[PDB]
Ligand binder design. Structure first.
Ligand SMILES: [Ca+2]
Ligand SMILES: [Ca+2]
Ligand SMILES: [Ca+2]
Ligand SMILES: [Ca+2]
Ligand SMILES: [Ca+2]
Ligand SMILES: [Ca+2]
Ligand SMILES: [Ca+2]
Lengths: 201, 193
């Protein structure tokens, strides 16, 4: 047996972190140490400030004997919400944050930073609207207020998976726009939404 | 023997809104206590309001039309949703006549009544919603617009469910009634920062 612990902790990072603007998400780091005890972690930008004030984790169970064994690793839950307005550039391969994590054991050994990547995307990437039941209208090019209400209700009823804070609008010819809370959108063309009532009876 | 026709009281303010059922009553009395029938016309010519109907309950019965208990004729109908409204609202009305007769056949003169009709927004007057607090007053988010609309709807169960409430970028509310007339709620009664 060696008189001292000279080996830093080992960190496992999640391999495919995907976040949608305005929606809470979470991912876990798993950490072990040959001593069985991890003291704390640091999230950084390769040693510089993290710069993501919306990302949080709990220090529950940090620096407790036995908290970080091979059989029972330390599981660190990181969570937050990418801001509703976070800019997504034209090349969506650039819509990500690459950051680093390291950890200390109780003997002062600190691991070397390893990377993790938070990819983020518009809410319209998460949601795929189903077509509503058809609303039958008197004039295909000039919907009444009651017909627009019915279209919106039908679009909403065909899509309970879509967020309640998304806003559904309807044009004069029955074209549907779904505007998600982050202002990304989805469209349903009118021919999938309305049909002429007289033509259909 | 009866030589005197019935007398007719008409309502003074018959005001109907497009697309919304209305009702009113004529009250008819005769010195005999009995009214046989009535006729609605355009000064003797055809009435020309196929959307108007009246009840003939209790016509031509003794005692149906006394001073104490006149014959109360219920009239109802719905002015068409698309009835055009002239720019001069003194012309947005139908002037018609009613006459009535007793069992001896004494007929009254034609008595005038006027059905005024108006756009739905002339009826409805939106109450204000609980205020919605927003992040930017010139650029509401989708979620904030949803909240504004829900609040306007929750405060106004009396407005037709078929009316459509829209919300602009600055929180201005438009209510479009089924007959396509509108009301507006200015942003300051609707949103705050
Ligand atoms: Ca160690
Ligand atoms: Ca989508
Ligand atoms: Ca008489
Ligand atoms: Ca009676
Ligand atoms: Ca009004
Ligand atoms: Ca009024
Ligand atoms: Ca709506």
């Amino acid at each position: 047996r060696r008189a001292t612990d000279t080996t830093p902790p080992t960190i496992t990072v999640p391999s495919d972190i995907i976040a949608y603007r305005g929606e809470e998400f979470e991912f876990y780091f798993e950490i072990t140490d040959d001593s069985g005890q991890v003291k704390n972690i640091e999230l950084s930008t390769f040693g510089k400030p993290l710069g993501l004030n919306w990302l949080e984790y709990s220090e529950d169970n940090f620096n407790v004997p036995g908290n970080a064994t091979s059989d029972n690793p330390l599981r660190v839950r990181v969570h937050g919400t990418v801001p509703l307005n976070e800019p997504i550039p034209a090349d969506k391969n650039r819509a990500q944050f690459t950051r680093t994590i390291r950890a200390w054991d109780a003997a002062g050994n600190v691991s070397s930073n390893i990377t993790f990547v938070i990819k983020y995307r518009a809410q319209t990437d998460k949601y795929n609207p189903a077509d509503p039941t058809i609303t039958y209208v008197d004039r295909l090019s000039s919907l009444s207020p009651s017909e627009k209400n019915a279209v919106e209700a039908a679009v909403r009823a065909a899509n309970p998976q879509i967020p309640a804070a998304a806003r559904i609008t309807v044009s004069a010819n029955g074209t549907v726009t779904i505007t998600y809370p982050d202002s990304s959108t989805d469209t349903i063309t009118a021919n999938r939404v309305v049909k002429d009532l007289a033509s259909s009876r």
